[PDB]
Design a protein around this ligand. Structure first.
Ligand SMILES: *Cc1c(COP(=O)(O)O)cnc(C)c1O
Ligand SMILES: *Cc1c(COP(=O)(O)O)cnc(C)c1O
Ligand SMILES: *Cc1c(COP(=O)(O)O)cnc(C)c1O
Ligand SMILES: *Cc1c(COP(=O)(O)O)cnc(C)c1O
Lengths: 466, 463, 463, 466
């Protein structure tokens, strides 16, 4: 009862060792492995220091202008600061753009926008999942609506041409006239090319819809001016703050302000609709410590060191892609414009499903993804590979070429295990063959060793080995 | 680069001073003031240490055994550990109960349950807001649906009797037959009594509905066995992990497993599917680690102690206010908070929260069951969790009752100088623009901050 | 062809004898029996002559002045005439009221209004079915939405006090604040009293809702000025044109025009758009001609007379039944029908409607406000419109009360031979399978058919 | 008060002269004019005699098997008879097909099926209106949902190829995979070719949807075996009973019964869903007199005189179309397979909007309709023309050739008035020029005279000049 006070002060290491132990083992796993997953990255030490601040303790509903309670002098300073830096980082004029920084994550942010501009059962159009789209853009089958976007709104996808790997803007322009979308989403999870915001904008205006850009995967590249900005043509732009922006987990909603169109002119009503949808609509108290982390990350994103980091990110992808082409791999759309590439593993007689398990055992992380062609979702042909994470650890073009060879070694290994499993074998069985087979298990042990040795040569951002 | 390598290592203090400065000023404000807001509390140092871990970097879509990406050996250990401790802390048999720990916060958790059990336009019944209910339980007017619960589902509220301050279970039982709810919510934001879970459960079963308990405000009291557990009669129980449980911000959804009547429970898969891939993306692992750490602390006897203290202080605080002539809604309290009806002093919570705020005493206005206007709320909601974490005891809270009283007297004064009838904007003008008054505040604040500084402020050493 | 030319000219009798035979047998059944069903009536010969006109052949999408096809000079004359007579018959100023006469029937009319003023998932409040409400006002259970009104909109019922038999306006006023209806329906299928339109209107305005009156059952009484007009307080009034108005089957939607409060009424265009192109296609012109003919007859003093007679007979019928020991719900009636609570005789309307049916006395079962079961309805609904059109007067209805009584006694008997507890299928078996009984029926039927034949049967000369 | 009885017996002529007068003037208008509107026809005398029967007086809720009230011995005989004749007329085995005959009209029938199989906000796919579709198949714009089908369900249209005039089945097969319809509608209001039920059925089964056929416009041709039956591939078939079937106004819903598919087999659940949706779902008491009329019409539809009438209907269309082609007119899809044709008036420098008004003044009835091309809905290019009505009056191939010339005279006249109105003139003004111009008004008066003389040579089915 008297030790209760020594409880709220006791460091984590002493307080709870079981959790401490896990954090350590995870920190170590992150260190000796190769992170090639397009969505992961390492947050800076400063950003992580903000998350554990006393900002966790302040409960504040509403926005800076109008809060439900008092005692928000500093929380207002903070939210305001965060909003200013966000507009600044993307070079936006606060008279033409606004920003909400309360979303808890990427998904929540998207959902808030649909709830504000679309309304229940409203129509939304997004990139089909197998063609590189995201769940929050809509996902359903003929018998069931899986994603929330599909459960509460009426969604229909547009696809990419399976022969070019690019988005079929023509067919989208046609279907939009039949579907009458209230909002069209321009954003992807596994697409290596730049989106034609200008064309998508012409299509949106043609049907009187809104053009929303979910730039979660390229927000970092956009700030460094390495890829066209979606802010030139969209009405709204949402984004996670982790991934390429390299902050903590949180989301943001950017929206236009001022005169929309003329004749005599009509105004943008986005701001109030969106603010109302986030709160009191969908959320409660904002996670202030997360806003502080986002703020810290936006300041770092405007440094020239970051702009450099990003040019490096893109350059490594080119090198990685070139090295894999030379090794005989087929890259969707032939190449990339950003930080990732979708490797069509059919050109090697295997599929991404079995390939991600073998590479994983070898401490090389990445994930399977269907290629535009793919006649089956149960046997995805590709592997999605990104460079943001490894580039933060300092890898350069020559380093990524070595990575290309490790990945290749892995694909060769997975192919060996596939011929050993059979023709109509199941992924369930493949995974068993991969664990209970000394012959294959030996190869893995070997490759993993070379991968972990190489990985250890580079630093691991964050707090002191924690 | 050579500098980019260290930019990611530069401590916050050096890296970004503008934000660092803010965190310091806020930490200080938290120290010299009296936190009487029922929903706030101070998270322990250990919990905060987990939030800033390298767990922020791991992206893990899915659940343990149902992961999308590889390399989740430890994230699985962590999520699993967190789920085990959650069931343990509330004394639940994993054969009869399950738990999802991915919700980002309280609201998200509630919304996921509605999405899983109710479905679009389904009917939901919750406690009316002015009667102490929460937004996520439904909130609409005759011309507009404000809360998401009201926008995507069909909600209708049940009220409390304005003469007793208690929930009118009889009228609810009657309306439920006409409304046909698919889910009834049992949870409150400003109600000082225990909920009759057993009666609410009989009503739910009568209409074939589900009984969901949103125990966000009393999850801490429940773990310490200080107030009846909603786990005895509900099908689902959601909860924030901050507030009385004293963790970081996150939410949890508890759901029954096993036989319902032979018919079985289908909650688990519906709820898991609704959280992800339904509503959320990658889970905030660092928050799950914080929740895990908080659940272990919640099972210590020191916590059990902390909680009995929380309830005790409320009783003392309420008794001291009654003696000072204040009227407590429903006469008293069973938990950690009380709704003080300020009509008994000729003022309203609207003006009173601004004056107490100026004096570094934090709390908020709330309408009393009677109240014929939402623009002039009669009460003040006061909670003890936060100050109790700083070590205040019964005698300390009696001194607090006097500070609050001083405040009410002061708010009344600015009100007597304004005249029986005057807008709120006038009242504030007279408070900030008067020698004798802004002077009164300055004085009271000084006594409040001196008293406050005598107690510790939990958290990381010092920002 | 030479025969195809005449196939289209061959009279029904020669053309299709099988159908002709059926029409004859039905016309005869209608003659020798006693029609006591509150919703049935006999349409005049003139009205029936219009239905078979060459108006069936004209396809006219749209409205007068808003037609889609050409060649509508006369269809416009007709629709316009019909609209003028409708407003006239109810004494409405075309500057304050409008009317749509395209609905195919009562139900379609109601549905069009909901679709125009309420919108998908909008809230509607109507009289509960077991308390004398109609399906189109909403009908659902805890597990399923039966009526279309319940499937496409969110409906909740209000009830009558089971101790007075009257609508509980107080409880409705209370629930309306919690439910927030967008439209409240004031109309009944089995309620013998006048509705308090003024009170319902105050409640509608309190929640910003619309007050719709479905006067299908009393449209005839309203035209004759025999019962208060719902046109004094409602925004919209829908109605079937058969039943008490005595026309052919069709519906009408009356809606306010002008200033609502300066805010104006937007009903007209919403309602017109909802009927077409919204819900319907080409209007049934021959039915509109029949309605027109019926509205002219409704304004004659002979009709005004017919109606006072209708109400008078009900009073006599109810008084004679009270004297025979029967209990009338809410003690009596204000209109054309009465709900007889058969519990006062130890039987239920379920068994009683089958026995009276066998005796050529038609009517139907209906639950009484009390009734703890929908599978064993306590009452019998009885109306006088139909028999009054055949010329029955007060003295005649007293004889009818005796036939009905004889019937109740008989149904009770088969019930005493079955034992205090026995399923319904048993009861019917004993009725049709017993010498003394099937014999009783045969006897009573004979007296009923003899009495019935003494009166004329309106309609075309003789089929 | 005593005359009240003489009121319910007084004939219409004496009772209400104002309405009687209207019926007469209308009967006469019908006689001296040429009915070329594809949806109109003349009901036989027998059918009209049933409508005014004492069947109007019987109120009966429910279906033959289970009614809410008693005294339905004959109403059951009648409904049952009507159901038997309906299945018979279309050659359906009552073990494989069922029928509901309570719908009040075509629209109500369609709506009942959507409500039973689709459910609120369910997805439906129908032929686009400007491409010859019907309102009840769905009709909306980017800013508003007009038709009830669009207000209560989520509809999206499929189009016809504007270069061939035919339905683009390929594009529909593609969009159906993205839209996931729960029901696909196969039926048209202005399409002159036969629908590929077999292909549409393959597409329905591909998405697990239902194939509904709205054969309102060709129900008569189907009974005479003059055009392929939709009953071979559809799950449900709805239909009005007027139009080509030549009965009174009412609707019917035909639905499959028995085993749907195998594996072990699953059954059809259409019957109960559809019956429940009609009542107590959407309707109240059925219009018995209308069911009697439908019954009488179905018996006439099975006579060889009818089968002959129908072959005649189709033959006249061919002749009419051939005569118009020879006069230089362009028929959409080159010709017709059924009873109607869409004449593209662009080939003459005018539009259907102005043409329908001039022909109307000349007592030649028909209506405008957009052609697949048409870049504007406010200036429809075509005229829809049908032969059912005139064929019932006895016109034959040679008669229709004379009709083609009257129509031509009309088009020539409308073109004269168009050059006289101007370039950017409005249809509002065109109509004024047409009424306040003796020059043009003289032409009309003349043509009308020749049209009415020709029309009077033929009989007008129905009751004795009433
Ligand atoms: C990852 C991603 C998201 C989801 O973000 P969360 O923060 O995980 O919830 C949304 N949209 C796009 C385009 C993404 O890449
Ligand atoms: C505070 C509270 C919430 C909201 O929690 P958040 O974490 O702010 O999102 C939900 N429910 C109840 C009952 C509460 O008291
Ligand atoms: C009978 C009745 C109806 C239904 O009329 P239909 O013509 O059968 O479609 C609708 N409303 C009320 C109030 C009624 O009594
Ligand atoms: C005419 C038509 C309809 C509408 O019928 P109504 O009886 O006028 O209500 C429906 N569908 C099709 C295909 C049609 O041609």
């Amino acid at each position: 009862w008297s030790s209760h006070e020594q409880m709220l002060a006791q460091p984590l290491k002493d307080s709870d060792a079981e959790v401490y132990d896990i954090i350590k083992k995870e920190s170590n796993r992150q260190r000796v492995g190769l992170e090639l997953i397009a969505s992961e990255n390492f947050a800076s030490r400063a950003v992580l220091e903000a998350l554990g601040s006393c900002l966790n303790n302040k409960y504040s509903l509403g926005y800076p202008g109008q809060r439900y309670y008092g005692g928000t002098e500093h929380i207002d300073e903070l939210e305001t600061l965060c909003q200013k830096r966000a507009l600044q980082a993307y070079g936006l004029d606060p008279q033409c753009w606004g920003v909400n920084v309360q979303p808890y994550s990427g998904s929540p942010a998207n959902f808030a926008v649909y709830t504000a501009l679309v309304e229940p059962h409203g129509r939304i159009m997004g990139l089909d999942l197998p063609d590189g789209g995201h769940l929050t853009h809509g996902f359903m089958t003929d018998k069931k609506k899986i994603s929330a976007t599909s459960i509460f709104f009426e969604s229909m996808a547009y696809k990419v041409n399976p022969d070019t790997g690019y988005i079929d803007y023509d067919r989208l322009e046609e279907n939009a006239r039949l579907f009458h979308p209230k909002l069209i989403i321009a954003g992807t999870s596994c697409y290596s090319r730049n989106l034609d915001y200008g064309r998508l904008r012409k299509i949106a205006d043609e049907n009187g819809a809104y053009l929303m850009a979910d730039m979660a995967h390229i927000s970092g590249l956009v700030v460094a001016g390495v890829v066209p900005s979606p802010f030139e043509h969209c009405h709204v732009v949402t984004t996670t703050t982790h991934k390429t922006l390299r902050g903590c987990r949180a989301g943001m909603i950017f929206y236009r302000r001022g005169v929309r169109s003329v004749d005599k002119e009509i105004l943008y009503n986005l701001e109030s609709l969106i603010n109302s949808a986030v709160f009191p609509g969908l959320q409660g108290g904002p996670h202030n410590h997360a806003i502080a982390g986002v703020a810290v990350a936006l300041k770092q994103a405007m440094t020239p060191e970051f702009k450099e980091y990003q040019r490096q990110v893109v350059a490594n992808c080119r090198a990685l892609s070139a090295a894999l082409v030379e090794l005989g791999y087929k890259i969707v759309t032939g190449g990339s414009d950003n930080h990732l590439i979708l490797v069509d593993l059919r050109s090697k007689g295997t599929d991404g499903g079995r390939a991600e398990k073998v590479l994983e055992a070898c401490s090389i992380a990445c994930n399977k993804n269907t290629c535009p062609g793919d006649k089956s979702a149960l046997r995805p042909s590709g592997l999605r590979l990104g460079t943001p994470a490894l580039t933060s650890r300092g890898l350069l073009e020559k380093d990524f070429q070595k990575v290309a060879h490790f990945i290749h070694r892995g694909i060769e290994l997975t192919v060996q295990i596939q011929d050993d499993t059979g023709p109509r074998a199941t992924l369930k069985e493949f995974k068993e063959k991969l664990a209970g087979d000394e012959k294959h298990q030996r190869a893995v042990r070997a490759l993993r060793q070379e991968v972990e040795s190489f990985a250890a040569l580079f630093p691991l951002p964050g707090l002191p080995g924690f």
